Amino acid sequence: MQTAAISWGTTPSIRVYTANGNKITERCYDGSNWYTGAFNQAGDNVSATCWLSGSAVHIRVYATSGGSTTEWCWDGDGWTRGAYTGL
Amino acid sequence: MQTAAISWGTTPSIRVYTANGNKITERCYDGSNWYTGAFNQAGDNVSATCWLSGSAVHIRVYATSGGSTTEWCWDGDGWTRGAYTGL
Amino acid sequence: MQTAAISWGTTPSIRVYTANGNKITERCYDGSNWYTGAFNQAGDNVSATCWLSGSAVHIRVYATSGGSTTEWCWDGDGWTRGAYTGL
Ligand SMILES: CC(=O)N[C@@H]1[C@@H](O)[C@H](O[C@@H]2O[C@H](CO)[C@H](O)[C@H](O)[C@H]2O[C@@H]2O[C@@H](C)[C@@H](O)[C@@H](O)[C@@H]2O)[C@@H](CO)O[C@H]1O
Ligand SMILES: CC(=O)N[C@@H]1[C@@H](O)[C@H](O[C@@H]2O[C@H](CO)[C@H](O)[C@H](O)[C@H]2O[C@@H]2O[C@@H](C)[C@@H](O)[C@@H](O)[C@@H]2O)[C@@H](CO)O[C@H]1O
Ligand SMILES: CC(=O)N[C@@H]1[C@@H](O)[C@H](O[C@@H]2O[C@H](CO)[C@H](O)[C@H](O)[C@H]2O[C@@H]2O[C@@H](C)[C@@H](O)[C@@H](O)[C@@H]2O)[C@@H](CO)O[C@H]1O
Ligand SMILES: CC(=O)N[C@@H]1[C@@H](O)[C@H](O[C@@H]2O[C@H](CO)[C@H](O)[C@H](O)[C@H]2O[C@@H]2O[C@@H](C)[C@@H](O)[C@@H](O)[C@@H]2O)[C@@H](CO)O[C@H]1O
Ligand SMILES: CC(=O)N[C@@H]1[C@@H](O)[C@H](O[C@@H]2O[C@H](CO)[C@H](O)[C@H](O)[C@H]2O[C@@H]2O[C@@H](C)[C@@H](O)[C@@H](O)[C@@H]2O)[C@@H](CO)O[C@H]1O
Ligand SMILES: C[C@@H]1O[C@@H](O)[C@@H](O)[C@H](O)[C@@H]1O
């Protein structure tokens, strides 16, 4: 089991991505209780980073399985495959 | 052996968390010397994130031992166990 | 394969570091296409963190190989080994 953690804002909001058995899942905190997030994608290894544009959070998750990394993008309207390619 | 790194402030401060032998230790930089920090807890995988309220640094460390992740919290006066649970 | 991801600014700029086949390479996004960065060092594990000084980025990459971690520094003018020592 392996995790990546990101946070933003003043509350703050926190996201923790966990890779286990080639699935990555997400736990979220937005100032109250922890809840299971909408992120669900394949991966044995995960890293993540985020930034704010004004009030909007943008997240990028790098999900690696085998020898292959897929970027997954949150920009406010669902998780979408990003343009990242590796070496 | 596996690490996690955070930073904050204009100096900046840096914390590096290392998981080896199912212990996680902490090396710190506050502008001067590297030094071993107050943090340690069990874990063989580690992620971390942090934010400022000014004023005070706040650090969350996610220590995974086997199939369980524990959150450990720095909010300016000691490490305390966080409300995080997994799936 | 294992990755670490950092980002800065509003474009944003992203760097993703990937340890694979016992070496760590870098993929870079500055607002258009992805490209392969100058970071290249030995290691089985990588973590990283960054901060801005105005619009100048500073990156610290912690490359681990065996029971030892080497810190690598970007401060505008190439990569330089940093003062980090482990336990
Ligand atoms: C109290 C409050 O305002 N909470 C906000 C949340 O509702 C936002 O979570 C996102 O909310 C939308 C509906 O508005 C939808 O439910 C999304 O699934 C949910 O997204 C979560 O957070 C994302 C950043 C991703 O991590 C995603 O996988 C999660 O499920 C959040 C985020 O904008 O803001 C809170 O303030
Ligand atoms: C400032 C900011 O966060 N802007 C957001 C863009 O980054 C988002 O994605 C980019 O959208 C264009 C066309 O809409 C194109 O599809 C790019 O590939 C896409 O880039 C993504 O994000 C980059 C940061 C990289 O992660 C790249 O690999 C990704 O593919 C758009 C969503 O359309 O939202 C803006 O708000
Ligand atoms: C100039 C100076 O004193 N530097 C400050 C540090 O000493 C502070 O570190 C904390 O110091 C207290 C002693 O009063 C104690 O030893 C804490 O363990 C130490 O905390 C460190 O930093 C925290 C963020 C955690 O990483 C903790 O585990 C570390 O051990 C720091 C922050 O309190 O401020 C400097 O200015
Ligand atoms: C904005 C900020 O930095 N606030 C700090 C809180 O984050 C710290 O913990 C949270 O404290 C409130 C009680 O005042 C509440 O009890 C939350 O459960 C507690 O949550 C922790 O922190 C969250 C961000 C998550 O990491 C959560 O799982 C943790 O358990 C308090 C410490 O007493 O300090 C505030 O300054
Ligand atoms: C289009 C544009 O102007 N992009 C800039 C990049 O060229 C800069 O990156 C680097 O460029 C120099 C030569 O100009 C050299 O090739 C550097 O190695 C390269 O640095 C990259 O980015 C760094 C932050 C590191 O991640 C490094 O390992 C990378 O290879 C960047 C520098 O920030 O600025 C863009 O605007
Ligand atoms: C912020 C500092 O930058 C350089 O001076 C490094 O040698 C230190 O280890 C630290 O990363």
Chain C nearest-CA distance from B1, in A, is: 6
Q: Which residues lie closer than 8 Å to A32 by C-beta, 6 or more apart?
A: none
Domain ranges of chain B: 1-82
Q: How far is the centre of ligand 1, averaged over its atoms, from the C-alpha of A73 (Å)?
A: 14
Method by which the model was determined: X-ray
Q: What's the farthest any 2 CA atoms get from each other in chain B?
A: 41
Q: How far is the centre of ligand 5, averaged over its atoms, from the C-alpha of B80 (Å)?
A: 40
- SS3 of residue A54 by DSSP: coil
Contacts 24+ apart (CB under 8 A), C21-28: C22/C65, C24/C61, C24/C63, C25/A87, C27/A84, C27/A85, C27/A86, C27/A87
- CA C46/CA C5 separation, integer angstroms: 10
Q: Which residues lie closer than 8 Å to C78 by C-beta, 6 or more apart?
A: C38
Hey, what are C48's tokens?
């990283």
Q: Would you give the DSSP letter of residue C73? A: E
- B62 to chain A: which residues are within 8 Å by CB? 3, 5, 16
Ligand with an atom nearest the CA of residue A31: 4
Q: Would you give the DSSP letter of residue A33? A: -
Q: Does domain A1-82 have CATH number 3.40.50.150?
A: no
- CA C3/CA C40 separation, integer angstroms: 14
Resolution limit, Å: 1.7
